[PDB]
Amino acid sequence: LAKGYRGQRSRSYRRAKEAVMRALYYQYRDRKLRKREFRRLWIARINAAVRAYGLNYSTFINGLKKAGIELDRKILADMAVRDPQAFEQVVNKVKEALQVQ
Amino acid sequence: LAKGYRGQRSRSYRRAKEAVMRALYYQYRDRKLRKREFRRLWIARINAAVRAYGLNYSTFINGLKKAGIELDRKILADMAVRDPQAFEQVVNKVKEALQVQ
């Protein structure tokens, strides 16, 4: 046991652990960056979808929250292309929650 | 709000609710699957790499466990190409451990 537990003062240990640390870093980074690329499209797409409805990503979000609708950007973005009419409903239910005087 | 919380028996509900579930089933299937192609990739390399040292994926995993070495096949398949030498050192530790008189 030298890589699972107990950090030997071994000459070989120091080298193997260094390799383990480099695997961890590179992977962790690809994950985060890959994940950043998506969140990027999710918002680009959602904004673009509510344009024709007189809204922008910012207003659609701060509106969804005051209507009690709990949905993620990956779900939002998906719906807009999978079921366009259902997507329209959420928007209306949000325009209703917003425009109230 | 036939989406976030409270499942009102309206036309909107069912429609928007089916949409959510479809977005969920799809994104879930892609993860599982993508996570499944890699799992196969890893094992295929680690095997081919432990080849010349006189072992296969099976024996190498049995050894990693008798020597108390907790490393992922994700980490493993990484080291095998990033630091071939350090990899050799884990091999030699498993092989050693393995033979007992």
From Swiss-Prot, chains A, B:
Keywords, sorted A to Z: Ribonucleoprotein, Ribosomal protein, RNA-binding, rRNA-binding
Alphabetized Pfam families for the sequence: Ribosomal_L20
Signal peptide: none
Gene Ontology CC terms: cytosolic large ribosomal subunit
One MF term in the entry's GO annotations: structural constituent of ribosome
Biological role: Binds directly to 23S ribosomal RNA and is necessary for the in vitro assembly process of the 50S ribosomal subunit. It is not involved in the protein synthesizing functions of that subunit.
HAMAP family found in the cross-reference section: Ribosomal_bL20
Similarity section: Belongs to the bacterial ribosomal protein bL20 family.
Protein name: Large ribosomal subunit protein bL20
Organismal lineage: Bacteria, Pseudomonadati, Aquificota, Aquificia, Aquificales
Gene: rplT
